[PDB]
Design a protein around this ligand. Sequence first.
Ligand SMILES: CC(=O)N[C@@H]1[C@@H](O)[C@H](O[C@@H]2O[C@H](CO)[C@H](O)[C@H](O[C@@H]3O[C@H](CO)[C@@H](O[C@@H]4O[C@H](CO[C@]5(C(=O)O)C[C@H](O)[C@@H](NC(C)=O)[C@H]([C@H](O)[C@H](O)CO)O5)[C@H](O)[C@H](O)[C@H]4O)[C@H](O)[C@H]3NC(C)=O)[C@H]2O)[C@@H](CO)O[C@H]1O
Ligand SMILES: CC(=O)N[C@@H]1[C@@H](O)[C@H](O[C@@H]2O[C@H](CO)[C@H](O)[C@H](O[C@@H]3O[C@H](CO)[C@@H](O[C@@H]4O[C@H](CO[C@]5(C(=O)O)C[C@H](O)[C@@H](NC(C)=O)[C@H]([C@H](O)[C@H](O)CO)O5)[C@H](O)[C@H](O)[C@H]4O)[C@H](O)[C@H]3NC(C)=O)[C@H]2O)[C@@H](CO)O[C@H]1O
Ligand SMILES: *[C@@H]1O[C@H](CO)[C@@H](O[C@@H]2O[C@H](CO)[C@@H](O[C@@H]3O[C@H](CO)[C@@H](O)[C@H](O[C@H]4O[C@H](CO)[C@@H](O)[C@H](O)[C@@H]4O)[C@@H]3O)[C@H](O)[C@H]2NC(C)=O)[C@H](O)[C@H]1NC(C)=O
Ligand SMILES: *[C@@H]1O[C@H](CO)[C@@H](O[C@@H]2O[C@H](CO)[C@@H](O[C@@H]3O[C@H](CO[C@H]4O[C@H](CO)[C@@H](O)[C@H](O)[C@@H]4O)[C@@H](O)[C@H](O)[C@@H]3O)[C@H](O)[C@H]2NC(C)=O)[C@H](O)[C@H]1NC(C)=O
Ligand SMILES: CC(=O)N[C@@H]1[C@@H](O)[C@H](O[C@@H]2O[C@H](CO[C@]3(C(=O)O)C[C@H](O)[C@@H](NC(C)=O)[C@H]([C@H](O)[C@H](O)CO)O3)[C@H](O)[C@H](O)[C@H]2O)[C@@H](CO)O[C@H]1O
Ligand SMILES: *[C@@H]1O[C@H](CO)[C@@H](O[C@@H]2O[C@H](CO)[C@@H](O[C@@H]3O[C@H](CO)[C@@H](O)[C@H](O)[C@@H]3O)[C@H](O)[C@H]2NC(C)=O)[C@H](O)[C@H]1NC(C)=O
Ligand SMILES: *[C@@H]1O[C@H](CO)[C@@H](O[C@@H]2O[C@H](CO)[C@@H](O[C@@H]3O[C@H](CO)[C@@H](O)[C@H](O)[C@@H]3O)[C@H](O)[C@H]2NC(C)=O)[C@H](O)[C@H]1NC(C)=O
Ligand SMILES: *[C@@H]1O[C@H](CO)[C@@H](O[C@@H]2O[C@H](CO)[C@@H](O[C@@H]3O[C@H](CO)[C@@H](O)[C@H](O)[C@@H]3O)[C@H](O)[C@H]2NC(C)=O)[C@H](O)[C@H]1NC(C)=O
Ligand SMILES: *[C@@H]1O[C@H](CO)[C@@H](O[C@@H]2O[C@H](CO)[C@@H](O)[C@H](O)[C@H]2NC(C)=O)[C@H](O)[C@H]1NC(C)=O
Ligand SMILES: *[C@@H]1O[C@H](CO)[C@@H](O[C@@H]2O[C@H](CO)[C@@H](O)[C@H](O)[C@H]2NC(C)=O)[C@H](O)[C@H]1NC(C)=O
Ligand SMILES: *[C@@H]1O[C@H](CO)[C@@H](O[C@@H]2O[C@H](CO)[C@@H](O)[C@H](O)[C@H]2NC(C)=O)[C@H](O)[C@H]1NC(C)=O
Ligand code: NAG
Ligand code: NAG
Ligand code: NAG
Ligand code: NAG
Ligand code: NAG
Lengths: 321, 317, 317, 172, 171, 171
Amino acid sequence: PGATLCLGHHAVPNGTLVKTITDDQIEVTNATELVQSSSTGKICNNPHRILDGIDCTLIDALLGDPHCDVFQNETWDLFVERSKAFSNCYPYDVPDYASLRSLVASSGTLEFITEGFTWTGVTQNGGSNACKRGPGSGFFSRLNWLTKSGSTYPVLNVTMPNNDNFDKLYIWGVHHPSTNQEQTSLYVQASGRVTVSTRRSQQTIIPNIGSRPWVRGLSSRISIYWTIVKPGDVLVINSNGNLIAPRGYFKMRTGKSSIMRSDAPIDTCISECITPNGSIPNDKPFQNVNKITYGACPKYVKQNTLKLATGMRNVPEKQTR
Amino acid sequence: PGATLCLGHHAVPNGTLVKTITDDQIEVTNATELVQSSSTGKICNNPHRILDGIDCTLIDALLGDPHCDVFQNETWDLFVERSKAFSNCYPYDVPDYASLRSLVASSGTLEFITEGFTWTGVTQNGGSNACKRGPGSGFFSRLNWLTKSGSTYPVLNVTMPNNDNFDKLYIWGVHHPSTNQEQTSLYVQASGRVTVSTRRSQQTIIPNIGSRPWVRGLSSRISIYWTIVKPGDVLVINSNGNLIAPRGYFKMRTGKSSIMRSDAPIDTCISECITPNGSIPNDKPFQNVNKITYGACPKYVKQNTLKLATGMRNVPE
Amino acid sequence: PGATLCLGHHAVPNGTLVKTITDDQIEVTNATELVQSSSTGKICNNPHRILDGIDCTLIDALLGDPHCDVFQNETWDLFVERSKAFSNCYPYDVPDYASLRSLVASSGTLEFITEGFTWTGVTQNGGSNACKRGPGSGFFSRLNWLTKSGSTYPVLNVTMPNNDNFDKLYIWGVHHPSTNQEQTSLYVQASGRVTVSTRRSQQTIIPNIGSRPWVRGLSSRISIYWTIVKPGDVLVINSNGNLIAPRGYFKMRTGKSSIMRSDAPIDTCISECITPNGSIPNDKPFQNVNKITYGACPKYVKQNTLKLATGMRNVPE
Amino acid sequence: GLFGAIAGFIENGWEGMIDGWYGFRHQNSEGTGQAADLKSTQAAIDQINGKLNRVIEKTNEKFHQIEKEFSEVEGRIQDLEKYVEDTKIDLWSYNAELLVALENQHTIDLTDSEMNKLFEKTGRQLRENAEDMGNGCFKIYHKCDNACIESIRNGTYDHDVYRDEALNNRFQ
Amino acid sequence: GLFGAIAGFIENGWEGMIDGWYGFRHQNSEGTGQAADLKSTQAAIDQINGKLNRVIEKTNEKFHQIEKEFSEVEGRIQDLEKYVEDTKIDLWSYNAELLVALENQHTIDLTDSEMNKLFEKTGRQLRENAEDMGNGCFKIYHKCDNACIESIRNGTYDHDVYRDEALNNRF
Amino acid sequence: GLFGAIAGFIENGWEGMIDGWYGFRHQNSEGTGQAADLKSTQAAIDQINGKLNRVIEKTNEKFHQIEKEFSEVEGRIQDLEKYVEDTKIDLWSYNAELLVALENQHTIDLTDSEMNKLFEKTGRQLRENAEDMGNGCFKIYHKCDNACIESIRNGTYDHDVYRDEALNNRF
Ligand SMILES: CC(=O)N[C@@H]1[C@@H](O)[C@H](O[C@@H]2O[C@H](CO)[C@H](O)[C@H](O[C@@H]3O[C@H](CO)[C@@H](O[C@@H]4O[C@H](CO[C@]5(C(=O)O)C[C@H](O)[C@@H](NC(C)=O)[C@H]([C@H](O)[C@H](O)CO)O5)[C@H](O)[C@H](O)[C@H]4O)[C@H](O)[C@H]3NC(C)=O)[C@H]2O)[C@@H](CO)O[C@H]1O
Ligand SMILES: CC(=O)N[C@@H]1[C@@H](O)[C@H](O[C@@H]2O[C@H](CO)[C@H](O)[C@H](O[C@@H]3O[C@H](CO)[C@@H](O[C@@H]4O[C@H](CO[C@]5(C(=O)O)C[C@H](O)[C@@H](NC(C)=O)[C@H]([C@H](O)[C@H](O)CO)O5)[C@H](O)[C@H](O)[C@H]4O)[C@H](O)[C@H]3NC(C)=O)[C@H]2O)[C@@H](CO)O[C@H]1O
Ligand SMILES: *[C@@H]1O[C@H](CO)[C@@H](O[C@@H]2O[C@H](CO)[C@@H](O[C@@H]3O[C@H](CO)[C@@H](O)[C@H](O[C@H]4O[C@H](CO)[C@@H](O)[C@H](O)[C@@H]4O)[C@@H]3O)[C@H](O)[C@H]2NC(C)=O)[C@H](O)[C@H]1NC(C)=O
Ligand SMILES: *[C@@H]1O[C@H](CO)[C@@H](O[C@@H]2O[C@H](CO)[C@@H](O[C@@H]3O[C@H](CO[C@H]4O[C@H](CO)[C@@H](O)[C@H](O)[C@@H]4O)[C@@H](O)[C@H](O)[C@@H]3O)[C@H](O)[C@H]2NC(C)=O)[C@H](O)[C@H]1NC(C)=O
Ligand SMILES: CC(=O)N[C@@H]1[C@@H](O)[C@H](O[C@@H]2O[C@H](CO[C@]3(C(=O)O)C[C@H](O)[C@@H](NC(C)=O)[C@H]([C@H](O)[C@H](O)CO)O3)[C@H](O)[C@H](O)[C@H]2O)[C@@H](CO)O[C@H]1O
Ligand SMILES: *[C@@H]1O[C@H](CO)[C@@H](O[C@@H]2O[C@H](CO)[C@@H](O[C@@H]3O[C@H](CO)[C@@H](O)[C@H](O)[C@@H]3O)[C@H](O)[C@H]2NC(C)=O)[C@H](O)[C@H]1NC(C)=O
Ligand SMILES: *[C@@H]1O[C@H](CO)[C@@H](O[C@@H]2O[C@H](CO)[C@@H](O[C@@H]3O[C@H](CO)[C@@H](O)[C@H](O)[C@@H]3O)[C@H](O)[C@H]2NC(C)=O)[C@H](O)[C@H]1NC(C)=O
Ligand SMILES: *[C@@H]1O[C@H](CO)[C@@H](O[C@@H]2O[C@H](CO)[C@@H](O[C@@H]3O[C@H](CO)[C@@H](O)[C@H](O)[C@@H]3O)[C@H](O)[C@H]2NC(C)=O)[C@H](O)[C@H]1NC(C)=O
Ligand SMILES: *[C@@H]1O[C@H](CO)[C@@H](O[C@@H]2O[C@H](CO)[C@@H](O)[C@H](O)[C@H]2NC(C)=O)[C@H](O)[C@H]1NC(C)=O
Ligand SMILES: *[C@@H]1O[C@H](CO)[C@@H](O[C@@H]2O[C@H](CO)[C@@H](O)[C@H](O)[C@H]2NC(C)=O)[C@H](O)[C@H]1NC(C)=O
Ligand SMILES: *[C@@H]1O[C@H](CO)[C@@H](O[C@@H]2O[C@H](CO)[C@@H](O)[C@H](O)[C@H]2NC(C)=O)[C@H](O)[C@H]1NC(C)=O
Ligand SMILES: *[C@@H]1O[C@H](CO)[C@@H](O)[C@H](O)[C@H]1NC(C)=O
Ligand SMILES: *[C@@H]1O[C@H](CO)[C@@H](O)[C@H](O)[C@H]1NC(C)=O
Ligand SMILES: *[C@@H]1O[C@H](CO)[C@@H](O)[C@H](O)[C@H]1NC(C)=O
Ligand SMILES: *[C@@H]1O[C@H](CO)[C@@H](O)[C@H](O)[C@H]1NC(C)=O
Ligand SMILES: *[C@@H]1O[C@H](CO)[C@@H](O)[C@H](O)[C@H]1NC(C)=O
């Protein structure tokens, strides 16, 4: 007589292979995926304030390209630049474009405060047929193209102190004519000069006359620069020709704002994590969707799958089949 | 009549919670803290040579601002720059200030060797009331403000070969007048130019004439540049106005020297690890005081506490 | 009567030490080294295409220094620059030398395509005795030194569209004269200017006149610049003096090519991983030979040895 | 695994045990039966749930960072930006690979361990009334009805009650 | 823990054992007593000293590095300097979190192991003179006075001396 | 190790066992002999080879990177390049140090475990015919000739055949 009492454990018909210290592939009863490898293809419009650039880069919205006028005073957590964006104003370059783009994107606002600059002895509000605003010639909204008044272009020496308790971002420029005829016809002097300075720093740009590739009707160019004025400092502008003047300053902020290149459409949903491919869930610790991310995101890794065992070793009963 | 023998382990009345692979909070008999999260608030003056900048930035001590004259030929392991520091000489800027500050800080010395430059046909030792030395006008001790002699300023073209077996650091400058009257009054020529070169490098600076915001009474400025001359190389300085000439060179070293921004006072004690908050002990492997450190320091982490179990699971009675 | 049955494990008389969580030194029966710490001292010429610069830096081969003419038709996976290389043409500097060296090394070719620039009203093909070719004066093969024709140097204004589907690299320069007399003698205008542009960006250089240290007979200099033109973009060059003109473009590629400074000799063998000390095997996951590597390499670590236990604890009799 | 039970002296798992991770199967005078052990099941599940929640302890949050794709060739600064990111990605990929390997080795060992604890706990209960057959089964040397089997499984088995009967069957 | 002794078949710890980490308690004809076991205590102690000294294997030494706080907005170069540092700090923060989780799991298992080792060693010592009660206690089937108890504790217990007496009481 | 066999209740290893990692030594009526156990040897060998091949799982491939040696003083950009590289090297050196430490603790523990598994396997095989002496040796309470020894080692030992003979010697 007697009895038998056998101890045992379960097994499942369909285990999953995982990796361990000793095995590259060994079978357990269950596992869970640690790498997020898919996106919806859409950027969720909440909880971050997403600003679709549409046809406009951030820089073109900053300068005030007319087809970007709709972005005046805009704010964002994430500015989204589309590959369809285009410029449609005066042809320009920004030496250190990437830094200006970065510092504006991080500031998260285009809030612009007009200031009463006094430009004695010059003509203001120059325009071009390459930057149409309505039916007539026009210019970047936030910039003031100064040229000679009557027969003279005086040495300009203007000042704008910062009496506020916030930093001012000033955007300004220098115009490069294509011919000596343009230089003297617009600025009298055969060679211009623009010096912008604060108490601790200064920038001096000398224009160069000559042809650049034809763009939107023009072989001439404008070069864009910027200056930050802290509280208690003062902006001084010194120029005897070729100045592209600011009309005021942009307010600067610090916060969570950034910028992203993406063609993904913006949808009404909720997602903390955004990639150029679209939003992704952040419940997993890793992701293989894109190394470019914004928000509360899983860490990017190279693996497309990583299985964490959630069960014991699966040892099926051996069969004679 | 038999006996009983029970095997067991100790426990303590109040253990401490630690984290494991499977539990974020489980109780063991004892643990030890792995994150240093406090400081004395003071920088210990040993074992590193600490140089308190007091009222002076490293750059102002380098150029030779008069209230920084006491720092001449000084050396340091760690130069400490204070937030109360101020400049009190000619208003200036350094393009790539951060790199000049870094390369001098890492060299660890202000040792300056005067060299016999000959400046033919110009006046030496220009000064300003914005940079007084005693009651009279003065200038940065290590720079030589050259102006016209009589009614002329000739083209200067001078040479200084490096015949030593070490690198020389030369600090020089360009003066930016505020008006054309200053320009021709000081340098005769209506437009200056400064070219400083070695065999492998060259820099030409054109002064910008015009008004800048008032600083210590002046709307003019000086811009500071530097040139390193290796053994066997040669310094050439070429200028027809606005040169702020070097008086010699700084000796360069390589080593453990650095610079730190801090207002922690300096105390007489011993500590290997220095943060802007003050010295911290380095017995623990991690620290949460400051990501800025100098010396043998625990690694900076985000956690304010991490408990290493030093005992078994605590199972109280 | 009965029997005894003992269970046991093997041992060796003298094991090897390994590190664990609890022990810096514990003896096991066997271990294997995880850190590659030696090199053969030679760079194996397979499987990567090795190009020995010998006497030439990559930049001097790019410009066409005459003793580097042999590299015109060359390509590489790894360009090897030797510490004995020397320049022997017109004295020059490259602002952002390191970036130009890097983008060329990464392109892996010096393939040069000549373009028919029309330089109206100037003399072409200037040379110097500081850059000898045969019995005469000469110049960088890929650059075209323009000077006045007759008594005039007109405003040069040429364009070159990129209608290919690859990027074009243009190398150009600016000549810095040593005196005003050579300036006007070569270019008529008292002040030169070189503007090179594409649709979205531009570079403007003003030449610098002045005396520099003597190099191969000359106090003057050339500064080297570059411009990449993408498909569908356009190059424009505009100048009224001192232009060192491109003769064409370098075809750029993208790929696995790089550059390394090394004096290790090149040998006939096979090795995936290259360091400046020579090739190293890559069977181990770590290496202590050099943080500079090329190829499928172990990761660089500071330890010169790390032992992975491959056996049990060694308990000798 | 380190303890030698799962995939060890226990030949295989039971696909028919669907209500628990570890359990008992018995044969006695009243037939055969199967029952899951809740305590051992719970101990392993709590630990795996514990480590799972530690791993997914929610993610870091990043906003403005560096650029990681580039439309122009630039040289030194872009080399460094790419190198910084590639370095970061390689180190995180290494961290992820080491994490799952360590976690999974430990999960196989801890589930192995719970099987062994249940087996040793059962044997201590039976004292001198049973012998270990070596395959996870005990031969019980006395008549053990369903009530008696249940008493073993719920921890209320009084070994003294059957000790005399079992000792005579064991020794002869 | 992996071995099922501490917080396992041993129900709780002894707050009264202040002279060791592991030990013995007995009841016999002469009363009750407690004694710490030095060898098992030291084995766990030596091991914990080992890992503690590895973790406190002192810190690296750094001098001039990069700047990590900035008073002006600069853009690209400063974006990278900040990102480099923030990347470093996250990786070290992860290393620290993982280090203590692995270390502490292992410390609990190794001390659990040493408890189990002492219990197994004792049972082997007693041979057929005792039975495991399942709670970390052995029932000893023979007269075992204080001299007999200490002999078990110091490893000089001759099981053959009591084997006949003990076998007769068991059966 | 965690299991207390190697450098535990087994006093030392056998320098004379050259054909396997674990094994048997016996003394019976026919003399003494030694034999290795293949299955346990394989289990340890197999697992150590497994972890070795995971560790040396081939290397990453890198081509153009950043410069890491510099012939001139430059300041800010060069400070960052060196700091990036120094940061990377310290994190990898830490990874290598931790990897080897974790692997090596585990290699010692798993080999200890395999010794223990063989010992428990043997004892379960012997049932009531043997007693654990506490030093890794079994006293076998019946005549066990060389064939009988082989039967234990190759897993075909029928305990019931000797149970009567062994029980009377034990009790
Ligand atoms: C009594 C007396 O002396 N009075 C003075 C006036 O004569 C003088 O006016 C100028 O006089 C000259 C001759 O003396 C000439 O008539 C000028 O007219 C220009 O004509 C050329 C040829 O047709 C034409 O050039 C074309 O420009 C286009 C694009 O040009 C715009 C543009 O859309 O960008 C037109 C904009 O209004 C203009 N804006 C400003 C602020 O000047 C811009 C700008 O000039 C450039 O973009 C700067 O780079 O140009 C294209 O480039 C074609 O290829 C090119 O042929 C100009 O457009 C005509 N100028 C204007 C203003 O329309 C005339 O200006 C006056 C000022 O000097 O002073 C009086 O005292
Ligand atoms: C009627 C009339 O006036 N016609 C004009 C011509 O006169 C004029 O030719 C120039 O005329 C002047 C006199 O008016 C003079 O004679 C020029 O000859 C130069 O003489 C100086 C003095 O000895 C001599 O300087 C030496 O130069 C070397 C370096 O020399 C080279 C070199 O190898 O680098 C020679 C190269 O050919 C030259 N290459 C080019 C493209 O010009 C280069 C180059 O100019 C420099 O590298 C620029 O930095 O220089 C060294 O510097 C010694 O220290 C120095 O003494 C020059 O070498 C002579 N120049 C030449 C070309 O031989 C004479 O040329 C003509 C052109 O200006 O215009 C007519 O209208
Ligand atoms: C320096 O050299 C460059 C290149 O030689 C030169 O720029 C070129 O100018 C021509 C004008 O002569 C540009 O031609 C334009 O091409 C666009 C197509 O992209 C056309 O849309 C334009 O056609 C209209 O406008 C013309 C105005 O002249 C009309 O005549 C015509 O019927 C159309 O209505 C226009 O032809 C050419 O694109 C540029 N090339 C480049 C590469 O930029 C420049 O002018 C020279 N500078 C000097 C000072 O000579
Ligand atoms: C501005 O000042 C400069 C420095 O004085 C002037 O440059 C000097 O110009 C002279 C002639 O014009 C050169 O003389 C030549 O020198 C070589 C020797 O070359 C080198 O040899 C030794 C090795 O023993 C080396 O150590 C030196 O540094 C030399 O550079 C002679 O062999 C020739 O015969 C020839 O005469 C000087 O070399 C040169 N010096 C430098 C440092 O450049 C320059 O001319 C002045 N500018 C003006 C416009 O006047
Ligand atoms: C030589 C002199 O003192 N001339 C008188 C002018 O100084 C004065 O104009 C005022 O000058 C102020 C600044 O003056 C100094 C200075 O920096 O302290 C005086 C120094 O001697 C002079 N040094 C040299 C080597 O020339 C220095 C220099 O010219 C400038 O710093 C160059 O930028 O200037 C300040 O600028 C006042 O705003 C200005 O009005 C005039 C009229 O008051 O009288 C002169 O006699
Ligand atoms: C074994 O592990 C897998 C994970 O790999 C488990 O599958 C998961 O089961 C949960 C059930 O709660 C699923 O979550 C649910 O999703 C629905 C929508 O799909 C949602 O509405 C619920 O609120 C809940 O979140 C999860 O999707 C599923 N994952 C996968 C990949 O299938 C499985 O249950 C585990 N099995 C055992 C026996 O533990
Ligand atoms: C360009 O315009 C600026 C601003 O109008 C002029 O700078 C100003 O110059 C005056 C000089 O009289 C400075 O005034 C001084 O102020 C101190 C106290 O601050 C006072 O005690 C002195 O008696 C003196 O008057 C004023 O600060 C300064 N403004 C700034 C912002 O620096 C400059 O002179 C003009 N230059 C030209 C060439 O037009
Ligand atoms: C050592 O010194 C550093 C820097 O001097 C200290 O870090 C600073 O800590 C304070 C508070 O602990 C931070 O204050 C901030 O206040 C704002 C406004 O209320 C708030 O939004 C922030 O969340 C934060 O609380 C300050 O920003 C921070 N500075 C830096 C650069 O991190 C550190 O706490 C000191 N440690 C010790 C132990 O003294
Ligand atoms: C997310 O988007 C990235 C690109 O933005 C995808 O990766 C690219 O895939 C293309 C396919 O043709 C490759 O040619 C590129 O080399 C890839 N780029 C990089 C940087 O890896 C990626 O596959 C997308 N992921 C998902 C899930 O959609
Ligand atoms: C000690 O361990 C190493 C690693 O397992 C053994 O080296 C291997 O030896 C075999 C031949 O026996 C080779 O095929 C492998 O390529 C070697 N591996 C490595 C990583 O080198 C070594 O033989 C062992 N020594 C002893 C005495 O067992
Ligand atoms: C590989 O080459 C490097 C670079 O030359 C060697 O590192 C140098 O070693 C010398 C002598 O020990 C030191 O004085 C230098 O400070 C080292 N330089 C650097 C940059 O680290 C390295 O030792 C060589 N290694 C082998 C195995 O050949
Ligand atoms: C932008 O904001 C400022 C301040 O809030 C305001 O004065 C200005 O009119 C605004 N401009 C637009 C176009 O909304
Ligand atoms: C914990 O740390 C040490 C023991 O190593 C000792 O100083 C301290 O009293 C311990 N605390 C407890 C509660 O055991
Ligand atoms: C500075 O440098 C040296 C000593 O190293 C000496 O020539 C000079 O006089 C020193 N001056 C001072 C003030 O120490
Ligand atoms: C490059 O190729 C051409 C034609 O294929 C050849 O004639 C020329 O000599 C080659 N140049 C070199 C430096 O080998
Ligand atoms: C062990 O215990 C016995 C009796 O309890 C005692 O007499 C003896 O001194 C102890 N030590 C040794 C080494 O025997």
